[PDB]
Amino acid sequence: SVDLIGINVAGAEFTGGKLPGKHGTHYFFPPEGYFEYWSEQGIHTVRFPLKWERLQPSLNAELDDVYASLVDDMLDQAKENDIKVILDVHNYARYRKKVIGTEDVPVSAYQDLMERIAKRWQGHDALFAYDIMNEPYGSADKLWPAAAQAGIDGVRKYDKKRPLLIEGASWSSAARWPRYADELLKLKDPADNMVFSAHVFIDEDASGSYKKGPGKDFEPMIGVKRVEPFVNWLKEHGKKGHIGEFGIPNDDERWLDAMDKLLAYLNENCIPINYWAAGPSWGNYKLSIEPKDGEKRPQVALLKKYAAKDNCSDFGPA
Ligand SMILES: OC[C@H]1O[C@@H](O[C@H]2[C@H](O)[C@@H](O)[C@H](O)O[C@@H]2CO)[C@H](O)[C@@H](O)[C@@H]1O
């Protein structure tokens, strides 16, 4: 099913500078019992970041069985708790700091990664979709459309049914989406099941740092206004959409009001959201909705409120 309400469960992509790194020290998968809390809160879809270099420490070669087995176990526990998972290659269109499409990371190497991801997990009932790359940016922007096509071709060799979540240039900015997304119109999916996925924060520079508070003259519809360029481009071109990353601090009611207004707008257009972020090792991270003693998480009640209003059967907009 297409749930409008989902969460990011981050941690497996942490500490990108430590490769391969050590599980429990540099990166973190959900412990056993982790998904139980979110299942009882009525959350049934999870977006799960992964690091390409840990999945595949050598281009064009087999996946690392140790890290991939941690993914196996995660998907099993999601199935235990009635959760479907979006796998997210959280790599900014780069492998070991080099852009997909340059000499050292040819698009064929990216295609090989996605072939291997799809081959290993297409048979897993808990797998919902592939977010084939998180936030292309910078020098990756011009090369990203060609990379995306190779990623699509790779998955479709082994999985011809699941949705493919296609992010855009410029950190997949929702507010800036129409400036660059026309180049994504050339993408071809034999299965005709692509969904575009933009990201939005409502701080000053949309970086999600929230260095400052809402400030005076704060516009509660700011979240709606920053996703309107994305949703209107989807309507103009007859495409389907998704918001794969959005989060707010827990310390100002004005943030919550804007998140309510955003979720209402997304509901009216059948656009799913993945809140950024839950996860087992976030510590004091200001956007975390993971339960923490000496923290309250008023974003969760808002998510649950709109999960009960979800009467969409497919990705919108209409
Ligand atoms: O949006 C999350 C993403 O933002 C990056 O900051 C961008 C920002 O998105 C953009 O709106 C602004 O104009 O430029 C900055 C970059 O200088 C940030 O670098 C990422 O870590 C983050 O994932």
Residue numbers in the entry: 1 to 318
Quote from the publication.
RBcel1, an endoglucanase of the GH5_5 subfamily isolated from an uncultured bacterium, has aroused interest because of its ability to polymerize cellooligosaccharides in vitro under near-physiological conditions. After the glycosylation step, the donor sugar is covalently bound to the enzyme within its negatively numbered subsites. Transglycosylation occurs when a sugar hydroxyl group is used as an acceptor instead of a water molecule during the deglycosylation step. Solving the structures of two RBcel1 variants, RBcel1_E135Q and RBcel1_Y201F, in complex with ligands has brought to light some of the molecular factors behind transglycosylation.
Our previous study of RBcel1 showed that the substitution of Tyr201 with a phenylalanine residue drastically slows the deglycosylation step, resulting in accumulation of the GEI. A Tris molecule resides in the −1 subsite, as in the structure of RBcel1_WT. The structure of RBcel1_Y201F co-crystallized with G3 contains four monomers per asymmetric unit, with each monomer containing ligands ranging from G2 to G6 in the catalytic cleft. The presence of cellooligosaccharides longer than G3 within the negatively numbered subsites provides crystallographic evidence for transglycosylation. Several water molecules were placed in the model, but they are not sufficient to account for this excess of density. However, the presence of G6 in the negatively numbered subsites of RBcel1 in monomer B allowed the definition of two additional subsites: −5 and −6. As discussed in our previous study, a displacement of the Glu245 side chain to form the GEI, adopting the tt0° conformation instead of mt-10°, results in a change of electronic environment. In the structure of RBcel1_Y201F in complex with G3, the same displacement of the side chain of Glu245 was observed in monomers A, B and D, where a ligand is covalently bound. In monomer C, however, a G3 molecule occupies the +1 to +3 subsites, as in the structure of RBcel1_E135Q.
